[PDB]
Structures are given as C-alpha cells and as structure tokens.
Design a protein around this ligand. Sequence first.
Ligand SMILES: [Zn+2]
Length: 257
Amino acid sequence: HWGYGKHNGPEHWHKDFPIAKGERQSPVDIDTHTAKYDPSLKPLSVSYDQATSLRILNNGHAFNVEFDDSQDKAVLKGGPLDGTYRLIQFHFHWGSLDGQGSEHTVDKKKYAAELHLVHWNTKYGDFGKAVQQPDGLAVLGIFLKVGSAKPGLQKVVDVLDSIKTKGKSADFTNFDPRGLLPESLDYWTYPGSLTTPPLLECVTWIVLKEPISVSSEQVLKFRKLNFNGEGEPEELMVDNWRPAQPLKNRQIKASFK
Ligand SMILES: [Zn+2]
C-alpha cells in the first residue's frame, strides 16, 4: 500500500523497501555545472520506427502505455549503453501545479511533468530478470514544460477518460512514441534506480536536456485521473513524483558541452 499520500508517500517507502536508502537511488538533482562532459559518450540511437503499442493501463500510481517487447521493434542503443534495450512501456509523473511534477531536477528546477520511456536489456531475456541486474534497464527521461500543445501527446490525452480509475485498461494501438521526443538528443546519464517501489538499482538513466512543451489543457487532463478504483473515494492522481535523492558516490556525465 505505498503511494504518494501523507501516510504512504516517498518518505515511508523505506520501511517496506529498504533499498530506498541505497547507494544508487533515483531521481537526483542534476547540477549542470558539476556534470562532466564525457567526449567518449556516443550519440543515442532511438529506433522506434517499428514500435507496436498495445494498451494503456491506469495502475493506481500512473498510466502506462505498453508495447510489444517480444521482438526488437522499438529499441534504445548507443549512448552509455552496451547492447540493445527494448521499449516495454512509457509513463509520466506530474504535479498538482505547473511548478512541480518532475522527478529529476535541473539545478533544483522542477518541471511540470517527466516522461519515462522504460527499456530492458535483451541479454536478460525478459523484464523481470532485467530488473535484477545492475545494467538491466535504460530509462529515457524527458521533461515536460507547460506552453504550446504537443500534438503527438493528444492521442494519449484523449483516451484518459476511458482509464480514469485504478485497474482500467484500454486498447491503444498504433501510437508512435517518436512524437514525444524533443529535437535534440543531448543528455545527462548516471546509474540509478526505479523511482517507484521496488526501487531496484537496475537503471542506466538517460535524461534529455531539452524539454518538450505540452499545453495547460493537456496537463489538466492528466490531473483528472484517479489513484483509486471505480466506486472507491475519488482521489485525484497528482503529485505522483518521488523527490530528488542523495547522489552519494556517483558522477553525472553529459553528452554535450
Ligand atoms: Zn517513472
């Protein structure tokens, strides 16, 4: 029964998930002045042309857009990564107000939301095995700011009414995740964790420098989702973000000067 409330939020997670206080937890603040440019980091290779979206699910903490990950259809490679990482799902974290919502921060700045495109290392055969490995996952993190609408997001926004409450799913085929990517793929990278329980320390984080813009109407629709199931007391799905964790013995690397 973890969540984001006063009684079960991030500050409580360590009681069930002691790794919450571990050595490579996420998110973190990205101090831009202290990140080191690593000229040997390769451009990212985002290969989403053959992506097969399947479904959208309200899981009680976010909504996941799920993909067919039984073949190499939508993959991430390059950058800091060795090998091939398959897209399994994406989801967002967002706030109750435009001035908060992101998990990572940049020089302590919070964005309105943050997109996580979750990928697993094919050498481990499935997602459940991958999360047990220190190089099991690669998560592409993209900040959202409120301004102009993002046309490539609208198909997501419009289905949200069909998955208002926990446990609801809807068919969500033919969605192209390339419509959520900013122009630049410049990034920061560091080793970290899942930002929700079980908080496993299996993620190579790749956080893009350039945010995408979404409209006030689009983010407002995120905030009309519910944490609860249908016929349970309505609790708006807002502020589903974990705050920055200690960096500890990690260095954040930048792909760009
Ligand atoms: Zn996430």
